RNA sequence: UUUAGAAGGAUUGCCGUCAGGAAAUUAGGUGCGCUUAGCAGUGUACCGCCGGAGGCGG
């Protein structure tokens, strides 16, 4: 339970939702399968509930150290280098909080209202290999210590 | 402890006949609208899944 803190700098024109989106996820996917080793993400200053606000932080939960330099984070969220920064240092922080998965339902065609603006206060679109459909996932923050593909806690 | 205390206004009905408002006109001179700006906020949520209602996968 060492870490890594990745940043997403402000300004820049384009949305730190956006940019969250797009670069950083699939990578992780990628990054967390092949390693299958279920990890997490710190989501700090994660704000509030009528929020969602990610916020501009990055980190990553590991247990070894050679198990996060198991990822290459520097080198592969590299190109993008005035969007994201890599820290250079593993932090054996303690003081971290996990985070978790919630659902909400899905349409009335596919009490919909009822669980629909209950956890539609983060909300971050992967669009699917297979299937092909993109698709919203949302967040949580809690207690629960010592999970899956995404980086958040198994269900 | 109040110029106190009390109270059935009722029934009925044919407004009507006629008519010329009408003639004249000059509204006119002048004029500085105008300096700034990101349609953003996320731009919207898909297929399933068992169950049978209720709960996770990509």
Redo the contacts with the bound molecule.
């Keep these: 339970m060492f870490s890594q803190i990745l940043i997403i700098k402000p300004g820049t ?6 940019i969250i ?1 797009e670069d950083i996820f699939p990578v992780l ?1 990628s990054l967390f399968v092949e390693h299958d080793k279920k990890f997490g993400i710190t989501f700090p200053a994660y704000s509030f509930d009528k929020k ?2 990610l916020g501009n932080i990055i980190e990553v939960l590991s247990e070894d150290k050679e198990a996060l330099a198991s990822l290459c984070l520097e080198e592969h969220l590299a190109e993008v280098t005035d969007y994201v920064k890599v820290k250079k240092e593993i932090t054996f922080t303690d003081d971290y909080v996990l985070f978790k ?7 009335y ?3 919909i209202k009822k669980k ?2 209950q956890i ?1 206060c983060a ?1 971050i ?2 669009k ?4 092909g ?5 949302f967040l949580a923050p809690t207690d629960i210590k010592h999970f ?3 980086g958040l806690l ?2």
């Design positions: 024109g384009i949305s730190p939702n956006i989106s996917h969602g606000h998965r919630i659902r909400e339902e899905n349409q065609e596919t009490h629909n603006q539609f909300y679109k992967v699917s290999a297979s299937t459909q993109s698709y919203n996932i899956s593909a995404y198994r269900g």
